[PDB]
């Protein structure tokens with residue numbers, strides 16, 4: 001592998017030099033002959049597998065605190081090694097847990113929000129034993145991160161995997177999401193993305209209000225036991241009704257969205273350890289709501305109704321009625337969040353911040369892994385600076401990974 | 414191994430076997446993906462490349478292993494022996510040019526690939542001859558607004574000291590002028606090329622839409638300047654269906670998009686001058702050509718006339734102006750009956766193209782980074798389509814700009 005790789009920005013002519021790719025760990029999916037960069041997704045560690053993974057992480061941590069090679073570094077290596085020897089696993093120190101969580105975000109190639117990576121509040125929930133305790137930790141997380149609309153990024157880390165039969169899992173894909181209900185006539189009420197999970201909740205005992213914006217309950221699994229349902233206290237769920245600065249009729253669509261984006265189905269890998277329940281939250285980029293949640297054909301799919309109320313000609317695609325309506329919806333989302341003083345970032349500001357972040361990471365860290373397919377926003381791509389920015393994608397650890405949906409693997413008791 | 418691609422909107426899964434036929438490199442490795450990087454012979458090297466191509470040609474006309482096929486391989490073998498190269502048959506040239514288009518991972522317009530008019534210009538020897546062939550190309554392809562895809566293929570590379578080159582990046586482009594006060598008049602993408610034309614004796618009108626002259630190099634000689642006859646250059650004044658003030662911006666564009674700086678590789682042969690043309694997707698003009706910060710950069714002026722609040726990015730004033738400019742472009746070409754496709758229709762057609770190629774060919778190499786349009790990405794169906802990118806040959810390739818290699 002070449003020692004230096006160059007990326008160019010075709011708008012500004014700036015050339016950056018990447019050396020950090022030499023620390024790349026796992027596989028991208030690509031080969032010399034095929035690129036899988038647009039593919040969305042392209043039994044535990046043995047003692048022998050765990051030793052080198054832990055050492056790599058411990059070495060990285062002690063290098064970051066400028067104590068590489070120190071007595072405390074060598075002693076930490078020996079203590080971890082003994083622990084892996086006698087128990088087949090090991091426990092992270094609190095400092096190492098925090099460092100690992102921040103760096104999994106720092107390394108998340110698909111995240112445009114990483115300029116914030118070092119300001120992550122880490123909640124250590126490794127003492128949790130029950131689904132009720134998970135609910136308590138999650139409620140505290142949601143309250144802290146929401147902060148009356150002055151949102152603060154945060155992660156809550158539940159106990160790591162042991163033998164794979166005692167996993168902690170949040171069955172929700174996000175902590176706060178709206179239910180979706182398939183109707184006998186084929187239509188869907190609510191969010192079509194969540195129909196499968198909604199049906200699971202109903203079978204587990206949830207009584208669904210069957211509305212358009214019903215906050216789903218938490219479905220929480222502790223220590224490999226069957227998951228249990230809990231209702232998030234509604235006063236902890238900050239929501240924003242969507243209105244438009246010019247179009248008085250926009251509020252009559254009855255749209256609203258929740259303020260806190262909180263991913264809860266990913267796995268956090270630190271030093272070979274696997275944290276299968278690690279819900280983390282930030283704040284929204286407006287297009288995540290205004291383009292994807294609202295205008296995806298397979299989601300709320302409101303382009304039609306908005307275009308109608310805008311009195312656009314919808315018979316020819318070349319009138320760009322979809323495009324025109326999409327912008328108004330995204331204007332409404334940003335205006336409504338700003339009016340209610342709920343943190344949100346538009347796609348222009350976020351991508352400009354990410355370029356500055358990337359350049360800083362290249363200069364101070366030797367690179368910044370980035371997934372262009374995900375970094376470029378889903379509207380107006382080429383009038384954002386990331387569109388013209390060449391990027392290198394590679395996998396560094398600590399990392400957030402996808403994992404199978406737990407209902408596909410769980411052994412019901 | 415067989416590889417699957419999923420469309421996350423429709424849940425359609427396709428199975429790719431065609432990638433097993435690729436042998437060029439992508440630039441990626443198992444550890445680093447370069448998917449967003451823009452740019453990642455001898456007798457001995459030539460015959461296996463020739464053999465592979467002759468093989469796939471005779472397989473395509475269902476006479477693989479025929480007597481004609483055996484004879485052609487031997488014919489090619491002797492010719493590489495006695496001359497260090499070979500000459501394609503006319504049928505092979507046409508097949509190879511259509512397949513270079515069919516294989517172009519970055520082109521959303523490939524549903525048309527087999528409707529390509531191929532002009533054989535391999536008997537050309539001088540820049541005057543190139544000019545004549547290019548004028549005929551432009552006239553045929555323009556067709557009074559009913560655009561027709563075409564490619565003109567000039568003689569192949571021999572020793573590399575005798576290349577045919579079109580120095581222009583496109584056959585028709587507007588000049589760009591570095592102003593005294595530091596800014597730029599016209600098209601900033603072409604400032605360097607414009608200056609080379611001036612340095613070669615071109616008298617610039619110093620307007621905003623001055624069609625550049627052709628700078629044509631034949632057989633490695635110094636390039637020569639030619640003016641395309643203006644009656645051959647179809648242009649469209651841009652106006653807006655609702656904003657009557659839009660025409661007062663004084664904007665226009667040319668109807669014929671015609672790439673002239675790429676290299677066509679067929680069976681190991683390299684055609685360094687191979688201008689090819691189709692018709693525009695509206696966003697190529699209205700998003701990239703007009704609104705890139707390094708291009709015409711008119712978002713400010715348009716948003717001004719729309720009286721948009723331009724003090725905060727979160728008003729999305731840039732996004733609103735962007736849509737209106739692209740409405741105007743489509744409306745203007747359609748009103749003048751000049752072929753153009755919008756990004757919704759184009760990506761729809763591409764999804765249908767992919768389905769066809771997976772069925773009859775076992776796959777379709779596609780570069781998501783280039784296929785997804787530069788605006789309103791996720792409300793087009795390609796945004797949700799997983800794609801596999803791999804290099805098949807015949808292919809179009811980038812090459813260095815001739816002013817960096819040429820000795821005068």
Ligand code: HEM
Nearest residue numbers: 105108110111112113116153154280281282283284285400
């Ligand atoms: C604080 C403000 C943040 C912003 C504005 C932001 C923005 C984004 C956006 C727009 C995406 C693409 C979302 C999509 O299309 O589904 C994304 C992906 C991602 N973000 Fe961030 N994010 C933020 C915070 C965080 C935090 C705190 C973490 C973890 C500690 C994180 C980790 C990730 C990961 C792992 C992905 C990839 C998700 C996947 O591949 O499925 N982000 N982010």
Ligand code: HEM
Nearest residue numbers: 514517519520521522525562564689690691692693694809
């Ligand atoms: C007929 C209508 C056509 C349409 C609508 C179309 C559309 C497009 C678009 C929108 C791009 C992206 C260009 C950019 O972003 O700069 C592209 C790229 C490309 N097209 Fe097509 N195209 C057409 C015809 C053709 C033809 C006739 C050929 C060759 C015979 C061709 C070969 C290519 C190649 C090689 C690229 C990649 C360019 C590069 O890598 O820089 N296209 N096409």
Ligand SMILES: Cc1cc(N)nc(CCc2cc(F)cc(CCCN(C)C)c2F)c1
Nearest residue numbers: 173261262263265280281282283284285288
């Ligand atoms: C922390 C955070 C901040 C932010 N501003 N945005 C997000 C994206 C929210 C999101 C929404 C979504 F629909 C899908 C995924 C992928 C991961 C979740 N699982 C489905 C794998 C997401 F991350 C996350």
Ligand SMILES: Cc1cc(N)nc(CCc2cc(F)cc(CCCN(C)C)c2F)c1
Nearest residue numbers: 582583670672673674689690691692693694
């Ligand atoms: C045949 C054809 C049809 C069409 N509809 N579109 C194109 C692309 C036009 C284009 C525009 C542009 F700005 C940059 C590049 C790549 C660099 C090549 N240079 C020759 C310009 C382009 F291919 C080609």
Ligand SMILES: C[C@H](O)[C@H](O)[C@H]1CNc2nc(N)[nH]c(=O)c2N1
Nearest residue numbers: 038039040373374796797798799
């Ligand atoms: C097929 C393609 O990989 C898929 O649609 C991706 C494209 N880019 C994306 N980018 C973001 N930010 N989020 C997404 O869900 C997707 N989806």
Ligand SMILES: C[C@H](O)[C@H](O)[C@H]1CNc2nc(N)[nH]c(=O)c2N1
Nearest residue numbers: 387388389390449450451782783
């Ligand atoms: C850095 C990045 O590869 C570069 O900006 C690419 C992105 N995608 C593109 N897509 C198209 N269609 N045309 C382009 O010029 C580019 N430029």
Ligand SMILES: [Zn+2]
Nearest residue numbers: 030035441446
């Ligand atoms: Zn790749």
